[PDB]
């Protein structure tokens with residue numbers, strides 16, 4: 001599943017038993033109930049530009 | 056950076072400036088509060104390991120505005136496979152003596168997972184390359200942080216599109232080509248160790264390190280970057296390690 005369009009994940013993707021797929025996030029982010037989207041849990045998460053995010 | 060533009064202050068917040076005795080050495084990328092990733096070739100001629108400084112939040116080299124943060128580089132970690140004076144395995148992991156403070160001007164770039172990086176990031180065409188390197192081949196270095204958008208090539212295409220030059224190193228599986236063959240836009244020697252940053256679904260990631268080429272913005276030639284995805288496990292294992300005495304440390308690769 002992960003092989004194609006990142007298994008629908010925003011960040012990381014893990015394959016399991018058959019057609020089971022788990023999305024995950026980098027440290028400083030948590031996964032939303034949709035199971036694909038990652039939301040920041042910290043003030044300065046990695047790979048996001050505060051001055052651009054604050055517009 | 057040749058053919059780029061000035062990176063607006065705070066839009067390359069993970070960019071590191073490496074200094075030795077106060078002099079411009081290389082670039083680097085911040086991946087968390089205490090680790091910086093740069094190029095192994097940046098440290099080939101170092102004798103004064105205690106005079107290595109990493110500057111975060113830097114933009115204009117002529118003025119101090121208060122957003123700059125200086126830290127001593129406490130450890131330089133290089134792969135066992137890297138040979139000084141050569142091109143392959145061009146990566147260095149730097150441990151800051153004390154953490155940097157995350158602010159609007161100092162933010163890490165995400166070190167991605169190998170899988171994600173190889174099967175998703177490796178296919179994003181364009182990426183940003185940045186530094187205070189020379190503005191032209193045999194030209195003066197920039198006083199303001201410069202940024203350039205460059206397209207990534209598959210190695211087969213790079214080798215086909217390039218002008219067959221002798222003694223020119225091979226493009227290994229630990230490298231990738233990115234840039235332009237028309238002599239208009241490139242990264243340069245002074246940008247060495249700097250980030251090649253990839254955008255994916257609202258977040259930026261570390262895909263490459265400014266490594267080498269056949270002259271800055273040479274026609275028929277692209278810029279060569281260290282393929283960071285190959286070093287994810289190697290970096291992670293070391294960031295989980297306790298500091299060891301001595302600045303330079305050579306670590307087994309793989």
Ligand SMILES: COC(=O)Nc1ccc(S(=O)(=O)C(C)C)c([C@H]2CCCN2C(=O)[C@H](Nc2ccc3c(c2)C(=O)NCC3)c2ccc(OC)c(OC)c2)c1
Nearest residue numbers: 096097099140141242243244247266267268269270271278
């Ligand atoms: C063969 O190995 C070397 O040349 N090694 C080595 C060890 C140390 C230094 S240094 O001490 O000046 C340091 C402070 C940067 C250096 C310095 C001095 C001589 C050139 N140089 C570079 O740093 C080049 N950097 C560089 C980076 C990106 C690009 C280009 C050039 C380029 O020409 N075109 C576009 C992309 C360089 C060129 C050619 C190389 O190999 C063929 C190479 O390999 C690493 C590195 C080079």
Ligand SMILES: [Ca+2]
Nearest residue numbers: 115116118119
């Ligand atoms: Ca400054």
